[PDB]
Paper text:
Thus, the native X1 sequence is incompatible with co-binding with Fis.
Fis is a bacterial nucleoid protein that functions in transcription, replication, and recombination reactions. To explore the structural basis for Fis recruitment of Xis to the X2 site within the λ prophage attR recombination site, X-ray crystal structures of three different Fis–Xis–DNA complexes were determined.
Residue numbers in the entry:
A (entry chain B): 9 to 15, 22 to 98
B (entry chain F): 1 to 51
C (entry chain A): 8 to 15, 22 to 98
D (entry chain E): 1 to 52
The structure:
DNA sequence: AATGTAGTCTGTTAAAAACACAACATT
DNA sequence: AATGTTGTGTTTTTAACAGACTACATT
């Protein structure tokens, strides 16, 4: 409910996800899909990390406290998406 | 009656690392929440570790 | 390139669509304390993914799990979370 | 070389349900018999299906 | 009849969390 | 000199994981 992308109206991010997948599922020509959770997750993690790090003016400690994840976890998540 | 982080920690059943204690404050794990009174924290004598 | 795109008319990624909802959220937040955001974002992304994949596999939990690349137990647990038991 | 149940199954001409493949191991229907190394089984990359 | 699945279990382990500590910066 | 940060180790706890299985469904 608190997360909305200015579509001009205020449609949730929940709806925005459903549409990208409807387009993906259509684009897929019956190919086997071994890992989708990660496809979606990596696409949502990379921007989330970039938004908070910007918001906390680079403070890893604060960024971690904000997201509700361990500092080690944030560090690991950043290193994944080459933000180390 | 108020105490320093050092004082409070040293009174606890299992005194922990000061870095860990200052971390608990930051993580809202100490009740009543200690506040920086100027340059440093004031834990109230009744302070306790919370979830 | 990025297989996940929402028809904005152009094809802008979901990665961009996430950045915008958060920019709006951060602005909407009137200095309230934010203890857990990862979950806020995650639950908002999981609930639709599940509903979509489940629809695509015509209700098959087994297949849905294999597709997402998560353990069957995990999918079951994820569904029960968002009341899709 | 050894493979996981998942890996082996996915290589087979007609990959079957993981639960079906497990039931088979339990039934001594995979040769050489895959072994439980901790949390999971290990199949010979060229392991075969047999009649019960 | 052979194989596939929902549901309800077990145990194993990789991952996250929590705690360390040594630098050095900020207060 | 107390407190905060980053970088890097450990130890502890959580959660995903593979599998066991039975009744029923699909093939």
């Amino acid at each position: 409910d608190v997360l909305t992308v200015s579509t001009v109206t205020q449609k949730p991010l929940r709806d925005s996800v459903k549409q990208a997948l409807k387009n993906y599922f259509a684009q897929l020509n019956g190919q086997d899909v071994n890992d989708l959770y990660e496809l979606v997750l990596a696409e949502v993690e990379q921007p989330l990390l970039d938004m908070v790090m910007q918001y906390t003016r680079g403070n890893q400690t604060r960024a971690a406290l904000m997201m509700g994840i361990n500092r080690g976890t944030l560090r690991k998540k950043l290193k994944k998406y080459g933000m180390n | 009656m108020y105490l320093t982080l050092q004082e409070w920690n040293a009174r606890q059943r299992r005194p922990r690392s000061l870095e860990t204690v200052r971390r608990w404050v930051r993580e809202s794990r100490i009740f009543p929440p200690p506040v920086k009174d100027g340059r440093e924290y004031l834990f109230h004598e009744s302070a306790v570790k919370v979830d």
